[PDB]
Amino acid sequence: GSSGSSGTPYRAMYQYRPQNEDELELREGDRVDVMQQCDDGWFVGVSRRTQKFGTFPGNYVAPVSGPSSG
Incomplete structure (x- = not known):
């Protein structure tokens, strides 16, 4: 019984190595x-492999959603 998390779909153009x-x-x-x-420019969301939450260089990921209106 609690609100859900709404985020935008993305794709990791390249592999990252978080230290x-x-x-x-x-x-x-x-x-x-x-x-x-x-x-x-960085982005903060959750992964789809480890289901973890943190921060990563958006320069490695990209908006797969496509042409959206805002």
Whole structure:
């Protein structure tokens, strides 16, 4: 009995190597669930492999959703 988490679908263009639990690991061709967008550009969401939450370099992932309206 609680609200759910709504995020945007993404894809890890390349594999990432997080040197801290805080950072979320990524794999070339992996689905990512972005939640918030960092000013600099980074993204903060959850992975689809380890179901973990953290921060990763958006430069490695990309918006698979496609052409959306905002």
